[PDB]
Structures are given as structure tokens and as C-alpha cells.
């Protein structure tokens, strides 16, 4: 049983459509964490946000070093509160804008962290279909943390099966992994274009190319992951064992 009076509120970390996220601290022990405040009146209008409740139930039973922890939640008369693990280094997206693009060691280490996390999720019957840089946070040691932002995803990261209105499964996560590996190395997504229509067309036809600096091992992995036919994509164990991943990962 938590209470608002148990925390000291600090600076705003980000803004959303149903409330904000603040840096906070437990008064007594002085423990740093993140607090998200949502307004009921807002939830019960944008839809029947019982979705929040299901998502909170699901997220609170996941324990992995590469998945952001939901420590708990409570509510009062007008607000609902989520107590979250704090990520000191911020978003991967912000880090990407600063460096322009990552080198092979950093990229390979990140892909390894995500495959492990996605593997644990699949065994828990949890499939994302979403995992943008903006939604990837960094811990104290620089480790990746997967957060739950789309609990309520532009075209760039969507797989062919989806925009083509077919049925999907856990194979969408392999596609996402390919788009991300590419964006990390090149600096931008593989199907980006001036119009929505052209992007839709390139994804469906799987039309993309690599800049000259991209390595052959990197091209190999990404070409295997971005397969039109979902069943032609490798298992997560095959990604963790790919020669390019093994050679450049710092472990
Ligand atoms: C972008 O800035 C942030 C968002 C965060 C954040 N956001 C977040 C919001 N919502 C959720 N979750 C949910 O909405 C949810 C819903 C249902 C069920 C479960 C979870 N998870 C994480 N969580 C934790 N830490 C965060 C840190 C953030 O920024 C950190 C920087 O400032 C620190 N700064 C320090 C100095 C150098 C530069 C970086």
C-alpha cells in the first residue's frame, strides 16, 4: 500500500497524452525512481482504459535485467500512479542523435541485449510488435531497458504482414530487430521516404540498400532478418549465434 505522501516529486522527465512522468524519491530511504501520473477523467474517455489495468498486471510480473521494472502502482480519487525503475542515461534515440550512428561493437552489444529480452518475453507469451529507439532507455551501466510506451508506432517499423493486413505472431519481433540493427549502423531506418505511400510500397516490396561503409557480416544478418515471408526469418537463438554478433559483441 503506497501513498502520494511517501514521495518527493522532482523535474518532469517527459510528457504524454494521459499524464506526465517525473523523477521522484522515497522520502525515508531517499531511493530514486520514476513516477507516472495519469488522470482518470482522461483515461475513461479516450476509450475504456481497462487496457491500462491489463497492461499493469502483465508488466508487473516480468523480471529481467533488460526490461524496465514496474515496482507497483496505486490511485486516489482523480489520479492513477505507476512507480517505475529510473533510467539515468535516458533514451537511445537521444544518444543516436549525438553520435549520428553507432560502431559495430556498440550495435552488436545492443542487439544481443534485445534478443535476450525478447526471448524471455516470448516464453512469457508477451509479443511486442513495437520497440522504437524513442522507447528504449539506458540504465546506469549503459544497459538497454525495454519500456512499455505503446500500451494504448509509425509505419517505418511495421512488418509487411501487418500493413498487408495478414495474421502475425512472434515473427514481427525478428523484423523489428532487423530495422533497428540497420538504423543503429546507418543513422536512419531502411524504408524511409518523402511520402507515406512510397514507404508503404518499399516495405511491402522489401526494397532497401546499404551505404558503402556497412560490413558484409552486417549485411548478411540484416538481409536474413528482413524477409518478406515471416517463416523465413531465423529463430532468436540463430541471431545470438550469428558470426557477426559473436565477433563484435563486448558480451
Ligand atoms: C525520456 O525521458 C526519460 C523517461 C524515463 C522513463 N519513462 C517511462 C514512462 N512510462 C513508462 N511506462 C508506462 O507508461 C507503462 C504503462 C503500463 C504498464 C507499464 C508501464 N515507462 C517508462 N522511465 C524511467 N526513466 C526515464 C528517464 C528519462 O530520461 C533520463 C534523463 O532525463 C537523465 N539525463 C541525466 C543527465 C544527462 C542526460 C540524461
- Give the long-range contacts of residues 140-144, CB within 8 A, separation 24 or more: 140/88, 140/89, 142/89, 143/65, 143/66, 143/113, 144/66, 144/92, 144/110, 144/113, 144/114, 144/117
Q: Looking at the annotation, which residues are catalytic?
A: 130
Sign for the pseudo-dihedral over CA of 33, 39, 45, 51: positive
Ligand 1 centroid–CA 88 distance in Å is: 9
Regarding whether 229 and 123 lie in a shared domain, the answer is: yes
Report CA Rg, the chain: 19
DSSP state of 151: -
Asked if 188 and 211 count as a contact pair (C-beta separation under 8 A), the reply is no
CA nearest ligand 1 atom 7, residue: 21
Nearest alpha-carbon partner for 21 in 10, 36, 32: 36
Regarding whether 182 and 233 lie in a shared domain, the answer is: yes
Domain's final residue, options 90, 120, 136: 90
Residue 68 Cβ contacting ligand 1 at under 6 Å: yes
Tally of helices (H runs) and strands (E runs) in the chain: 10, 7
> d(Cα 45, Cα 59) in Å, to the nearest integer?
23
Residue 145 Cβ contacting ligand 1 at under 6 Å: no
148 is in an annotated binding site: yes
Q: Which of 67, 71, 137 to mutate to test the pocket of ligand 1 (most atoms within 8 A of CB)?
A: 137
Domain residue limits at 126: 91-251
Regarding whether 212 and 131 lie in a shared domain, the answer is: yes
CA nearest ligand 1 atom 36, residue: 89
State the method.
Answer: X-ray
- For residue 214, the tally of other CB atoms under 10 A from its CB is 15
Regarding whether 198 and 76 lie in a shared domain, the answer is: no
> d(Cα 8, Cα 47) in Å, to the nearest integer?
31
Kindly report the CATH number assigned to the domain that includes residue 152. Answer: 1.10.510.10
Asked if 35 and 7 count as a contact pair (C-beta separation under 8 A), the reply is yes
Structure's resolution in angstroms = 2.1
Amino acid at each position: 500500500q503506497w501513498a502520494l505522501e511517501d514521495f518527493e516529486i522532482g523535474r518532469p522527465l517527459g510528457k504524454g497524452k494521459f499524464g506526465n512522468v517525473y523523477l521522484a524519491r522515497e522520502k525515508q530511504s531517499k531511493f530514486i525512481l520514476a513516477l507516472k501520473v495519469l488522470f482518470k477523467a482522461q483515461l475513461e474517455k479516450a476509450g475504456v482504459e481497462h487496457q491500462l489495468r491489463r497492461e499493469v498486471e502483465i508488466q508487473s510480473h516480468l523480471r529481467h535485467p533488460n526490461i524496465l521494472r514496474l515496482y507497483g502502482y496505486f490511485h486516489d480519487a482523480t489520479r492513477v500512479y505507476l512507480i517505475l525503475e529510473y533510467a539515468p542515461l535516458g533514451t537511445v534515440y537521444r544518444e543516436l542523435q549525438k553520435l549520428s550512428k553507432f560502431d559495430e561493437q556498440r550495435t552488436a552489444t545492443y542487439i544481443t541485449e534485445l534478443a535476450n529480452a525478447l526471448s524471455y518475453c516470448h516464453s512469457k507469451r508477451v509479443i511486442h510488435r513495437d520497440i522504437k529507439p524513442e522507447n528504449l532507455l539506458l540504465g546506469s551501466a549503459g544497459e538497454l531497458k525495454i519500456a512499455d510506451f505503446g500500451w494504448s508506432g509509425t509505419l517505418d517499423y511495421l512488418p509487411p504482414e501487418m500493413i498487408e493486413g495478414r495474421m502475425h505472431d512472434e515473427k514481427v519481433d525478428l523484423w523489428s530487430l532487423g530495422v533497428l540493427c540497420y538504423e543503429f549502423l546507418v543513422g536512419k531506418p531502411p524504408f524511409e521516404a518523402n511520402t507515406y505511400q512510397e514507404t508503404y510500397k518499399r516495405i511491402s516490396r522489401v526494397e532497401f540498400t546499404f551505404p558503402d561503409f556497412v560490413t558484409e557480416g552486417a549485411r548478411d544478418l540484416i538481409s536474413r532478418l528482413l524477409k518478406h515471408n515471416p517463416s523465413q526469418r531465423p529463430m532468436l537463438r540463430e541471431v545470438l549465434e550469428h558470426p557477426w554478433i559473436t565477433a563484435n559483441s563486448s558480451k
